[PDB]
């Protein structure tokens, strides 16, 4: 390809062919000149080496290079390897009618919808716009329609809404690990430049919203649209192919909403009152007459299909909360009431969706998922579940445990100089007693965090499960675990060295107080190894799946 200037592209096949033809012409010239056998033998050797370089360069000892000692690519170098015609241009190709932009949440959507930017769907569904404009007679030829579209008149938007009405698009994230990484959504035109994505499918995509992008593809033919709707639509991908667990499970905000809503404390704005239905419970709560965490007796009607597919209702009076009564209003007819009458974490919601899918079907499951997401977001916003610095309460019996453990360490250190304990068992026991102090501190922390909340029964005090926001979003399963809360309020632990030697003095400070100039450097070893393990050891785990796919 000619570039700017008289020079040409740094082609390698042409250079190798130049070398081979030059050597071959020289050999043919020397064959007629009756050159001495040594010279023609050397030239034949050079021709053989040049041809071997053209066929598969580098298969000999040293590879030839064009410029700056860069080994140029021969014919085999563009058939083999990761940059060959097989893995780069045949098994995977660049694709027309494709897009790429950042993603945002937009929780107002439904399970089968996404948000394409209005200035992107115009570029994607452009030939469809041309066809409909020619059908309606607004344009005359392809050139006129193209000019009208690029000028973005007042009616091309009114035509774009017709080509996109029920024409699904494929949203694909970059690492397509499993088959749920490509799903089909019915587009909804929005003003902006970010592809909105339903919050439920983020678990399947493994797509946070901290700056990642997704690729949108347009099924062109009729069969492609029908496959996108019947097979790849997100409403038909609620079950993980890996295991029978649901994959559209609420994650980290709907879970917190449904955990704050479906939980009781022993006191209320109105506690002993008896309600006559979930609708009246919602009316009571929204009016500010009773708290969401009351302990009432609402009269409910739970349907049951224990017959051969017939829904027979049974009404009773169960001791529940106001929040559980409100949540029951969205549960479809056919589920037992002993599914929301608890403290719904994340496993509880996943099992709720699984039972709903097994009992009712797919359409009620999709409706239930949308309603759960809506009522989780609403009653999570109405809670204001913040996180301060007082929530991470350090147990008072922490520095006492530290002093006792350090006294034991000093005693063992002194015993080391007495010759009773060598540099073996002494190191082992000092590590073990530091671990003992660690578990005692963590147990004191997790006993002060949840059950240590004295509340008044209005007759006297009693205990309950805490409303400590850190513990709330740790118990609900929204985000966090025992390790994170242990490292925030308790002690951090025993951060070892990269070789494998556990540090003699474990970090006794957490991220609620400070960290010393040296404890941070100790933690940096483990943090850097954990960051490097991903970057330079996901390659083998991504090669394993390639081998597994190619063998099967």
């Amino acid at each position: 390809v000619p570039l700017d200037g008289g020079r040409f592209a740094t082609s390698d096949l042409n250079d190798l062919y130049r070398r081979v033809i030059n050597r071959n012409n020289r050999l043919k010239r020397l064959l007629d000149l009756a050159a001495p056998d040594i010279i023609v033998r050397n030239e034949k050797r050079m021709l053989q080496e040049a041809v071997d370089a053209l066929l598969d360069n580098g298969r000999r000892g040293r590879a030839i290079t064009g410029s700056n000692k860069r080994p140029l690519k021969s014919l085999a170098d563009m058939i083999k390897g990761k940059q060959g015609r097989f893995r780069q241009n045949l098994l995977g190709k660049r694709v027309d009618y494709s897009g790429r932009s950042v993603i945002t949440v937009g929780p107002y959507l439904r399970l089968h919808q996404c948000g394409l930017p209005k200035k992107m769907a115009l570029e994607l569904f452009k030939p469809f716009i041309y066809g409909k404009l020619e059908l309606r007679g607004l344009a005359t030829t392809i050139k006129a329609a193209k000019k009208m579209v690029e000028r973005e008149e007042a009616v091309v938007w009114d035509i774009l809404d017709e080509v996109i009405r029920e024409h699904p698009v494929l949203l694909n994230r970059a690492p397509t690990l499993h088959r749920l990484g490509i799903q089909a959504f019915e587009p909804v035109l929005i003003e902006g430049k970010a592809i909105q994505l339903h919050p439920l499918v983020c678990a399947a995509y493994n797509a946070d919203f901290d700056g990642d992008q997704m690729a949108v593809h347009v099924p062109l033919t009729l069969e492609a649209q029908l496959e996108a709707r019947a097979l790849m639509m997100s409403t038909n991908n609620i079950l993980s192919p890996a295991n029978g667990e649901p994959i559209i499970v609420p994650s980290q905000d709907v879970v917190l909403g449904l955990y704050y809503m479906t939980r009781d404390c022993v006191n209320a704005k109105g506690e002993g009152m008896v309600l006559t239905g979930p609708k009246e419970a919602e009316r009571l709560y929204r009016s500010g007459l009773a708290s969401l965490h009351a302990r009432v007796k609402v009269r409910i009607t739970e349907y049951e299909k224990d017959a051969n597919g017939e829904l027979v209702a049974k009404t009773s009076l169960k001791d529940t909360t106001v929040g559980r009564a409100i949540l029951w209003m969205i549960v479809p007819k056919g589920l037992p009431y002993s599914i929301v009458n608890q403290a719904l974490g994340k496993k509880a919601i996943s099992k709720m969706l699984n039972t709903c899918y097994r009992i009712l079907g797919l359409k009620p499951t999709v409706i239930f998922a949308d309603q759960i997401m809506y009522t989780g977001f609403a009653y999570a916003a109405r809670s204001g579940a913040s996180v301060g610095i007082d929530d991470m309460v350090i147990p008072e019996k922490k520095h006492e445990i530290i002093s006792e453990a350090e006294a034991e360490v000093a005693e063992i250190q002194e015993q080391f100089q007495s010759g009773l304990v060598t540099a073996g068992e002494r190191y082992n026991k000092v590590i073990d007693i530091w671990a003992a102090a660690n578990d005692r501190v963590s147990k004191a922390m997790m006993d002060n965090l949840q059950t240590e909340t004295v509340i008044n029964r209005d007759g006297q005090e009693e205990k309950q499960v805490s409303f400590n926001s850190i513990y709330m979003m740790a118990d609900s399963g929204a985000r966090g675990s025992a390790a994170q809360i242990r490292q925030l309020a308790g002690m951090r632990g025993l951060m070892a060295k990269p070789d494998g030697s556990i540090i003699e003095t474990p970090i006794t400070a957490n991220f609620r107080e400070g960290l010393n100039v040296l404890q941070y450097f100790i933690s940096t070893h483990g943090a850097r190894k954990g960051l490097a393990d991903t970057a330079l050891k996901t390659a083998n785990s991504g090669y394993l799946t390639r081998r597994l796919v190619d063998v099967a």
């Binding site: 083999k80 893995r87 045949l90 098994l91 496959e227 190619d550 063998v551």
Partner: protein, 66 residues
């Protein structure tokens, strides 16, 4: 193993596109092997309907027509 069990398949195109392209193509050329476009990777490479899903009916019709 899953590497050798993929390199030693019946269709040389899959083994050529997976790993060790030179060592597979050389052996196939020496032995004069004849591909059949049986699996999924071969049909993906050639550019046909895969005999996997909605194309399984088409591939079944094609096989039963001969």
């Amino acid at each position: 193993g899953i590497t050798k069990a993929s390199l030693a398949t019946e269709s040389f195109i899959s083994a050529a596109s997976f790993q060790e392209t030179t060592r597979v193509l050389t052996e196939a050329a020496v032995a004069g092997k004849r591909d059949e476009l049986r699996g999924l990777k071969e049909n993906v490479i050639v550019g046909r309907l895969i005999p996997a899903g909605t194309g399984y009916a088409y591939h079944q019709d094609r096989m039963r027509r001969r």
